[PDB]
Structure formats: structure tokens, C-alpha cells
Write a structure and sequence with these properties.
The chain is of the alpha/beta class. It has a single domain (1-135), classed as Ribosomal protein S11/S14 (Nucleotidyltransferase, domain 5), CATH 3.30.420.80. Helices cover 19% and strands 21% of the residues. It has helices at residues 43-46, 56-70, 99-105, and strands at 13-20, 25-28, 40-42, 77-83, 110-116. The protein has a five-stranded mixed beta sheet with strand order 3-2-1-4-5. Strand 4 (77-83), helix 3 and strand 5 form a beta-alpha-beta unit. Helix 2 (56-70) runs parallel beside helix 3 (99-105). The N and C termini lie far apart (57 Å). The structure holds one RNA strand of 78 nucleotides. It is classed as ribosome. Keywords: Kinetoplastids, ribosome, cryo-EM, ksrp.
RNA sequence: GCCUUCCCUCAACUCACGGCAUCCAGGAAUGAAGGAGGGUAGUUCGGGGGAGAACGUACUGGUGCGUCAGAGGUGAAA
């Protein structure tokens, strides 16, 4: 088929970048290269209304269309990299994390070697805000 | 306790005895304050100060390699 035919009957390790924020959730597909990709999924496609595009439901509904497209790319095993937010944002992911993982596991994809890959500064620029804060 | 004898006074000059040759005023000042100043030493002690050279990720932008439809953002939106 389109996917494995020289890696077939053997697990293949993709990589999945998960970026969870409070405006959307992203689920991306990479192959231990990051130079080539197959699919880019956003919460906002599956669920409409901007509040609910970062909600748990968004994640899970999106996650099932990861699995759908992975089994056509020969990908079976998935390494995962969880990302929070920017280095001048916070250090907290949105609610779309922890939802996506479970949705993939339950959908028969293997998961191993999860990691925390996020941009944390040694130090960076003045954080957005003010001296007196947002109020 | 003391005298004498005996061992018999070491740091390259040290100890004992003698010649006589020299040079030539000099030691008579209160003390050293849990008062001040200074010296020396531990390659002491420290986000102390100046200079010069590298290092770290992030933010932002650009470039290249891929993907494809929404993304920013909010209480909700725009």
C-alpha cells in the first residue's frame, strides 16, 4: 500500500507533537525527522466556536483522525512529545492535553517514550504584561 | 645550696687566655585607651567596582526542507 511495504509487519515509530493552549489544540505528524510530515490537524476543524476548540472534546475528536491517517502511512507505534506554551507565555498546557493521549491509546495505537519538549528560556525578553499587571 | 677538680662552653666563627694597636659623648625614655592611622599574612572573604574575550536558551525576523485550512485572541467576540 501507500505506507509500509519495506517496513511491513514491523512497528514504525512516528512522532506526534501535541500543543495545547487555551485558544486551540494542535495534533501534528512527523516521522523522526521533522523534515516531512503527512497531516496537520487542528481542534478548530472538528469543533466550532472558539471556546470549545481548546476543550477536551476537541482533542479526542481530532485524535481519531490521527489514527485514521496513520494506518495509511504505515505508522503504528507513536512517540509523543507534549508541549505547553511559549517561553514568554506560561508553562501550563491547555485542557486539550491528557485527552488526546488516551484517545490514541484506546484507538489501538502504541505509545512509548513520551517526553516533555517545550520552550523554557534560560532567560528571554520582558514578558508581555505591565508592571501593574493585567488587572 | 656553694667552692674546687674532671668532663674542659657546638650555629664554618663559636668558646678560653695574652699583646697593646686603633676608634670614641650617648641607654634614662610615663604609658600604649576593647580611641584614630599605618605594616605583614592566609593564591583569606564576597550577586563590590572597571576592562577585554567567549557561553546559554528563549523572544522576534529571514532562509531552506515538508504538510494544508484555518490561525491570532477573549468572559463571548471583533
Amino acid at each position: 500500500f501507500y505506507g509500509s511495504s519495506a517496513a511491513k509487519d514491523e512497528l514504525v515509530y512516528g512522532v506526534v507533537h501535541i500543543y495545547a493552549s487555551f485558544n486551540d489544540t494542535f495534533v501534528h505528524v512527523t516521522d523522526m525527522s521533522g523534515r516531512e510530515t503527512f497531516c496537520k490537524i487542528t481542534g478548530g476543524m472538528k469543533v466550532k466556536a472558539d471556546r470549545d476548540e481548546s476543550s477536551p472534546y476537541a482533542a479526542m475528536m481530532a485524535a481519531q483522525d490521527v489514527v485514521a491517517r496513520c494506518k495509511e502511512c504505515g505508522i503504528n507505534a507513536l512517540h509523543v512529545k507534549m508541549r505547553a506554551t511559549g517561553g514568554v507565555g506560561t508553562r501550563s498546557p491547555g485542557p486539550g492535553a491528557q485527552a488526546a493521549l488516551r484517545a490514541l491509546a484506546r484507538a489501538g495505537m502504541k505509545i512509548g517514550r513520551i517526553e516533555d519538549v517545550t520552550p523554557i528560556p534560560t532567560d528571554s525578553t520582558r514578558r508581555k504584561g505591565s508592571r501593574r499587571g493585567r488587572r
